[PDB]
Design a protein around this ligand. Sequence first.
Ligand SMILES: Nc1nc2c(ncn2[C@@H]2O[C@H](COP(=O)(O)OP(=O)(O)OP(=O)(O)O)[C@@H](O)[C@H]2O)c(=O)[nH]1
Ligand SMILES: Nc1nc2c(ncn2[C@@H]2O[C@H](COP(=O)(O)OP(=O)(O)OP(=O)(O)O)[C@@H](O)[C@H]2O)c(=O)[nH]1
Ligand SMILES: Nc1nc2c(ncn2[C@@H]2O[C@H](COP(=O)(O)OP(=O)(O)O)[C@@H](O)[C@H]2O)c(=O)[nH]1
Ligand SMILES: [Mg+2]
Ligand SMILES: [Mg+2]
Lengths: 431, 51, 37, 59, 433, 431, 42
Amino acid sequence: MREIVHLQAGQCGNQIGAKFWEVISDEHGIDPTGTYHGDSDLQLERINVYYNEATGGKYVPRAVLVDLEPGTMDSVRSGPFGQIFRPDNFVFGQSGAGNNWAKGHYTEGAELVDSVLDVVRKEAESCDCLQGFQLTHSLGGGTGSGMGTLLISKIREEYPDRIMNTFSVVPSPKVSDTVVEPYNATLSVHQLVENTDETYCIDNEALYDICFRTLKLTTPTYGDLNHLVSATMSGVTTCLRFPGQLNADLRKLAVNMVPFPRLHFFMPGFAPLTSRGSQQYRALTVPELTQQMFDAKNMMAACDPRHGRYLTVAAVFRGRMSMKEVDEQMLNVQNKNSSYFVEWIPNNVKTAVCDIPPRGLKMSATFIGNSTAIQELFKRISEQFTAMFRRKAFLHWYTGEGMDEMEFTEAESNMNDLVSEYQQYQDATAE
Amino acid sequence: QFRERCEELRTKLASIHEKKVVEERNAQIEFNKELKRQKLVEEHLFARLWE
Amino acid sequence: NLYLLGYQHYFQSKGNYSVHQNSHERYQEAVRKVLLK
Amino acid sequence: TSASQYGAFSPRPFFFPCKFLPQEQAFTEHLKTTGFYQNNSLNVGPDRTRTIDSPNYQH
Amino acid sequence: MRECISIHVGQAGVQIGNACWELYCLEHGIQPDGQMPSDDSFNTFFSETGAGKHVPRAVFVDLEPTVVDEVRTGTYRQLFHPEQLITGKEDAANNYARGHYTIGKEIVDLVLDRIRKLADLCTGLQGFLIFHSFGGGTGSGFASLLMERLSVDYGKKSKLEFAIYPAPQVSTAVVEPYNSILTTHTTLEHSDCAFMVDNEAIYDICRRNLDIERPTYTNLNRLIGQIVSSITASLRFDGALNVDLTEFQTNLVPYPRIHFPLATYAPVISAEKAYHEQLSVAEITNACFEPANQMVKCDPRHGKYMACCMLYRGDVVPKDVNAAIATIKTKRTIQFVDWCPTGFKVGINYQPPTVVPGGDLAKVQRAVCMLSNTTAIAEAWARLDHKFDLMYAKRAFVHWYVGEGMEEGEFSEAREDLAALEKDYEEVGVDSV
Amino acid sequence: MRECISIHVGQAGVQIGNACWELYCLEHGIQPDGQMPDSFNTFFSETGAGKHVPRAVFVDLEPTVVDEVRTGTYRQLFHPEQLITGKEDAANNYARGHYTIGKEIVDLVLDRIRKLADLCTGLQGFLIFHSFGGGTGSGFASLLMERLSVDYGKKSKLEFAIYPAPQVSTAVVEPYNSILTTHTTLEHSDCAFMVDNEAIYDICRRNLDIERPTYTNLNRLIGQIVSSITASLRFDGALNVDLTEFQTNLVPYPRIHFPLATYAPVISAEKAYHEQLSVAEITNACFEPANQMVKCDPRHGKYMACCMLYRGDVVPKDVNAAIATIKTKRTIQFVDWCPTGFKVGINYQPPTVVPGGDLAKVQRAVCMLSNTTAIAEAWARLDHKFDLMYAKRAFVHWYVGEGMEEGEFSEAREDLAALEKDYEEVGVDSV
Amino acid sequence: AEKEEERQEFEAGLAANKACLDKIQRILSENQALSQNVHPMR
Ligand SMILES: Nc1nc2c(ncn2[C@@H]2O[C@H](COP(=O)(O)OP(=O)(O)OP(=O)(O)O)[C@@H](O)[C@H]2O)c(=O)[nH]1
Ligand SMILES: Nc1nc2c(ncn2[C@@H]2O[C@H](COP(=O)(O)OP(=O)(O)OP(=O)(O)O)[C@@H](O)[C@H]2O)c(=O)[nH]1
Ligand SMILES: Nc1nc2c(ncn2[C@@H]2O[C@H](COP(=O)(O)OP(=O)(O)O)[C@@H](O)[C@H]2O)c(=O)[nH]1
Ligand SMILES: [Mg+2]
Ligand SMILES: [Mg+2]
């Protein structure tokens, strides 16, 4: 009908989706063992989007978890919803990559790309009309940044028409855990521009900023961080699973978010995050969602969008709201701020409404926006990648994998050409 | 799931953990004391042999 | 602790299950077939 | 002899860590020892026109 | 599963292996006999029999029998497989030539067959941990040739190196600089990473922070075991950021000729001192940068850091880790090379380090290990070069090695190799600003 | 959050530290073990074991003075590293403690200062205590400030210093150390609180009836001075005044940071029986020349800045009445360019008492920080005595033999000559 | 009727918060650091 195969790459990817799948099963009333105890007929009306049918009233994951290290996956199949997955979709090798992008992309990845291609083909042919796939991974590791790129490039050839999302975790300069980070990141975004329909730039340091200030959590783990990206990407396909006053899907946003094929990077954000001192002194309303969202402190990317221009803005609202108050706010932000919006695109805003409120909440909103501030990330990464590469530091690890040197040069060049043309769209006269 | 989904329990666990670590360290202190007593008596008996 | 706001299950707060035995294919066939009590 | 001191320690519980959470390989070990999922079958799949499958078009 | 094999060489090697293995047995739960009184977290070091026994993956080797017979007699006489403990009747007596050309070649084959059997027992192996000294004749020459043969036996496998480097002032030998000069070609062209440590720095650290006077080799060995435990803890036990050996192998080495990081441990304090001190992530990571706590008599401030690998352990939080790293980067005297603004490789582990009875370290809920690759180590090789040059000028003790039967030109060859490596370190230290 | 670190130097500093830190433990309730059976957080610091550790650095060039602390009742209260000793002392020599013995332990202290500083989040300043007479209190303290000032460009550095008494003296070569230390307290100090031991001797014998005192009596009244200054930071009050507030409103020119302290009321319990104490009565004694804490008479000079510290059951209405009466008295003079010269800080908690002390339990108190130019006559006496000795070149071979240049003696004498001259110009009241 | 329904929903939210606070109290009273495994010699 309209099905999604959830591709999973790396320790980042496995932990992100495990929290994500914990959320969705609660959204559809599924126990840790797999059945449906709920009383919502509309929870089962569209459960085949993410799950597959099994005997005995059981519903199974349509996920393929991938890693290069055995240690991560028992952590998945021992957790809150460990047993809901099936052992065959669990695919993983014996030797890690050591944060080396080349190893997972060329040397060790090639032995495992076959088996993951096998299982995803069966999840593809299991569904009648597959809408498109979906991957969560990190640009800072060896498998998600590495193998994850090799997976996408193959299934683009196999399934060209199908949409392809990616919630790629981009590294932060303020907080980085990897010396060899810039080499992997520069060699992966070159794969992302060519073969991806849709990308969301999630940055961990931003999640550390949002928890310290708005949430005032004393000791945040990565589990709180995983819950943020799960609620965001629950808010992207919420209109797909449930009916609404004005419906949409991923493809409805996809055509409406891409003026030109080189630009598919966006800045997700969540509306209703308040601390526990803020719950008592609040009155939930459509304006208060727009006030919390448009605050650039709230964004989960790593750049301030006042330094650029909004190309296109999406707002997927969830709950029961009056639409006059919905559209009047979207017009109101365009009129007041007369400098942050592109002029050659009037009515920059796409808005969708899903009637079913979010889990555990009465009102919410989700946002996908294309700005010029995304180029602030790359040029800062290019500031570090060139500093690595001018002295050929850490190069023998990648050179010994069998690649040449011009692949680095074309990577930055294509990366430099992207931000160069991206800068032009900021400074462009409409008339 | 609800064990994971609370922070104040992590605070209380850390507090009680450190509190019990203190008493374990006290046991280590008594261990060190008995070692020093042992070496002292070794020196005394060697002095007796010299005399 | 993002959502220790009260959980407040929506549909739980506010028949055909006996017809289709909580099966998605049976419900699809039913809603094509009317047969909803 | 000083070398004999290295193993002159009777086991007592307070030389031991407060908690103990090791790596348990009970499931992925089996999944390694057995072959992974792979299908060598014959080509099986319905013909699909996606948007509508099998209507009753007629004059 | 991920397994590692220990190849303790020499008297230092077997003593260090003894301390490390007492630590491992106490940690994982094994009795001195070898049984469990009560998951498979021991698989990296121990193999499990049908009867419930745990068998070491460690080949003690020495050329003097006594140093292994006390091991064969001691409390762990039954834990350790006797054919793992390999002995020779006569030893090199601080003669690299003897340990390389006359005496080692008799039992080369036996040691190679046993390590072949141990690697056969292993299914997917991770690394060979080498423990030796730069001064001893056996631990220099026999170690050197076993690297030479083991390199072609296993081309791809990681060969970690832990070595006692001759102290700049105190010495237990007079003929040590010749052996230390001639060994360096092996740790240059046939090693993956090295951890040279001088006993003098550990002595200063112990008498300064631990406040234990009159130390011995046991006190040093317990710290070295703590270091190796911190290295292997991410492998043995889970962590939110687990780091295997290949990850920190990659994120420390800029060029193939530079595989000499420097170790650091904190907190290392007495229990009475730990009574009045709050121990936090910031405090422990600031203590790991002090030059007085380095395990090598060199000052990193005289050089510049190119890389830093970081291993937290215990009850640690990524927020505090990031705050500490931010403070360290804001520090000015803590300098970094111009071609590395991002130079940290962080891994965290849950289980706090255990404590050995009768030892010295009081148990601390969180702990830090640092593996900093800086360019301040070259001055130690400069001191070695100066002493070896003033040695070799008058041709003292050379008759011993020549009558053993090696050519004299290898002395000059090794001297030129180490001079070139020092020049390489200077080239790295040069900045393109 | 407010944090202060004590940097007590010399045999005076240790003995002052014994009285002062004992006062703080009784003020907050700290057991001699160090356990409370966050007003304490300005002085103490929490540990994992629930132990509070003082933020102090006790330094001495001889071990014996600190060895009494190491075996005292408060042995477990103090951390072993904080107490720093030395094998040989300067022996009433500035030069030994400045060039030969000072450099021996200057650096190890700075390690301990940093660790105490890093434990603190927001540092207000450093309270530094030493003496002008002894070599360690004068020589070593001079180097530390020079390194501290270039290390901490902004953090405050207060000075409670023992000045030589005008008539009595415990040393012969004490004018040499007193003169040449004045460089540090000029270009590396923010405020000063010079005390001659004589001025406490008559105050106690006249007011507290103890006809035969000791230094412990002298130390305890010094403790009340420091406590009253810090009491505003420790506890809540109607008008809290921090270090930066009264530093600003006491120094009209950066070369003038030498006020005079005055504590009131200081009466024995039995004579406190006959005296009803009010805000007016105590604030009149703060201007009495007989109760002055420095051997000088302000009636021969003129106040330019008066800082007023109240504490206890005080009322702002009665404070204003007391100030008005003070201004209507021709015996008290004020400079022309300061028509308004007062600074009132109000605290709530009354000062505590020590068993075996000298002061009675009093509900209200008052501390006084009055800058006057009548302190000018004090160093002129010191100029007269130094010049009367330096002409014959006595004791000079000691300082020369250590390796300090003889021209520094003349330069030191000249600097105080310009110092006294400046205080005449401020005393001049021009049109 | 609409405003009555919203008021009762608000009361239901308050009751849920009270219940979760009470179970917070109970799991505060509980005490364990076992993590499904004590050390093998304990
Ligand atoms: N840190 C440390 N060093 C040791 C220990 N035992 C021996 N050494 C070092 O070993 C060096 C000398 O070599 P040995 O280990 O004694 O003997 P060897 O390596 O087998 O070589 P030969 O003496 O020729 O047999 C000395 O410089 C010591 O520093 C030890 O227990 N701890
Ligand atoms: N008021 C007061 N003065 C003190 C105290 N202790 C020492 N002094 C003064 O300090 C002067 C001498 O210096 P000391 O403090 O005794 O010793 P030092 O400062 O360490 O210098 P050295 O004697 O050279 O080591 C004497 O003139 C005393 O008046 C004290 O507890 N209270
Ligand atoms: N926000 C967040 N980031 C994570 C989480 N787990 C891992 N990461 C990030 O992932 C990076 C390590 O990825 P890695 O495991 O090497 O990726 P792989 O090589 O593809 O398996 C680190 O820099 C972390 O910042 C998580 O639960 N939340
Ligand atoms: Mg030997
Ligand atoms: Mg003195």
